[PDB]
Point group: C2
Chain length 354, copies 2
């Protein structure tokens, strides 16, 4: 009973290290079959997310396939057993496509290095959103990024007044949310950043020290910087970088410290695959290291708690949660490219309104 033309950004070439998006991605026109199975729905993309972790998804994405990503979609149509009905707004891993057919169920990431199952699509309730907390925050402080930061700080890390908290990769939205929440819990907060502008932004956000990870050239330099920045050692480490900065942090962990491992930029992007062994350092401190994969927290109860507990703080300017919303489906790969550019006009979460 039907088809429609759509556009997709597909993976044309696997390129290691820092992405060249113009070479990796190609925009194609794709005829989408619109006849829905029983549980299927036809969705229209409204916003897509661009995130540094897409660098790894992309390398694991079969050539010719669309680029997966977090997105906000609108149900255009729905078969008889669909979880949502036309007009519903939903958040799921819809990707860099203007339109798609999906049943919304959890779905195994077959070609992944780790056999991940993307979560079932979730329904957005528009009453949560207005001009101080727009719908796009469902891909940011009210979505994946916010759930990652809020989940780590309320379900694993137990920040206590007087703790020293280090946040690597603090310039991105997840780490700025973590530093701020840690500051709110009485902690001294040490961040890392890639430029002096980023460094200045973090301190105006409440970070007590900001190490320029340009020094990563020398572990000893980095360790010195950290020792000075954290003269009493490190109680909590929120890690998005790995590499020489995490090496340094593990040499100065205090007793009972907690390390949350969220991403490893230096290994994934910069190909740092070999280095000092870190497990010898956690023994005497009785440190706890936990991998973060915040899809495990995608439950109705958590989205309610996240909205009540965090939405208030954002709306009343207690929590800074910045978004850079770019325009147009054709500009998705360019907006993604800005994430890896040292030249930084990117405050917080970069998104694309389609």
């Amino acid at each position: 009973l039907g088809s429609m033309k759509t556009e997709r950004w597909v993976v044309r070439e696997h390129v290691e290290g820092v992405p060249d998006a113009a070479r990796i991605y190609e925009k194609v026109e794709t005829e989408l079959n619109t006849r829905l199975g029983e549980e299927q729905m036809l969705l229209k993309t409204l916003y897509v997310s661009v995130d540094p972790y897409l660098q790894g998804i992309c390398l694991d994405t079969p050539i010719g396939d669309h680029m997966g990503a977090d997105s906000i979609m609108q149900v255009l149509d729905a078969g008889p057993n669909a979880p949502f009905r036309p007009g519903d707004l939903v958040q799921g891993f819809g990707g860099w496509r203007t339109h798609l057919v999906s049943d919304g169920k959890p779905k195994l990431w077959q070609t992944g290095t780790f056999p991940m199952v993307f979560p079932a699509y979730r329904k957005l309730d528009l009453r949560h959103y207005d001009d101080a907390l727009p719908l796009s925050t469902a891909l940011g402080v009210m979505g994946g990024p916010g759930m990652t930061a809020w989940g780590t700080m309320t379900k694993f890390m137990q920040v206590r007044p007087g703790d020293t908290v280090v946040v690597s990769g603090a310039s991105g939205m997840i780490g700025t949310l973590v530093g701020q929440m840690a500051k709110r819990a009485g902690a001294r907060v040490v961040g890392t950043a890639g430029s002096a502008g980023k460094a200045r932004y973090l301190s105006q956000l409440g970070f007590d020290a900001v190490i320029d990870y340009k020094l990563a050239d020398d572990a000893d330099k980095m360790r010195e910087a950290l020792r000075e920045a954290a003269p009493d050692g490190v109680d909590k480490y929120f890690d998005s970088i790995g590499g020489s900065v995490t090496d340094a942090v593990f040499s100065m962990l205090n007793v009972g410290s907690q390390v949350a491992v969220c991403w490893q930029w230096a290994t994934q992007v910069q190909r740092d695959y070999h280095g000092p062994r870190l497990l010898p350092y956690i023994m005497f401190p009785r440190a706890t290291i936990r991998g973060i994969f915040s899809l495990e927290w995608f439950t109705e109860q958590n989205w309610s708690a996240l909205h009540e507990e965090l939405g208030g703080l954002v709306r009343r300017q207690e929590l800074v949660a910045h978004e850079t919303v770019q325009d147009g489906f054709e500009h998705i790969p360019a907006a993604y490219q800005t994430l890896f550019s040292a030249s930084e006009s990117n405050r917080g979460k970069v998104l694309v309104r389609v």
Copy 2:
């Protein structure tokens, strides 16, 4: 009077790596002042522990000082304010000495790579020991090694029926305790060993599979050996070895897995300080890694619970805790040397009865 002669093994030389006990240590006669402060007491060594972790204590020991070690001692004489009366049996870090004077209080290991505090001497009660659990077990299944295994399995690791549990260094006392406890909890248990007699020993103790690292250093032979022994991935890892075994285990961690890091033979003894980055492997499984330092559990309540739970299991022939007791104060560095030798017919805790 007011004096007595003693013997002491003193650190004559620092040799890194596998220890050459005959060269490193030296038996000296030493005159001991038997005039005691009101809180001091004069102690006679009854048994002395030899442990692989003394290789690192030795490097921290000022040339000429006696070698520290766990021991069982008896009070020859006490001041009217000493915590223990004459005749009382006590356990503490008394060292490779026939006699010593001490107040039994917590003592900081100053030359330690980290500020460690040795615990206050504890009183041993003869009621807790019998022909199945003799006094010497206060250095073994009823001392530090038992506390480490029991503490990790009741305070951190939650083995569930059907888990696969990997135990590094499985033929030492700590690793065989953990393995048998994991089996009772319904796990499939995989151990690692150096010889075929060592692997046989582990199989006699109920380990479902044993992996030989003697022939495996290439972590690809290791990873494949591990993949065969644990075809459904690893749920719990109790690590005393580190090295390429640990690297292999981290590549096959299941969701919700737990890693207990208790020592790193490969780092401390064989000096394997560099290796592949392991933290990228813990994100998707949401693995939890914890440094184990069992001194934090030396409390009266834990000791009492250790004797109840673990001691009862041992008396009922449900847990096997083996001990190899060498005799003679002059053979202590010889008994220590067998820990690091191949051609090793050692079963469980190695001790010297003096």
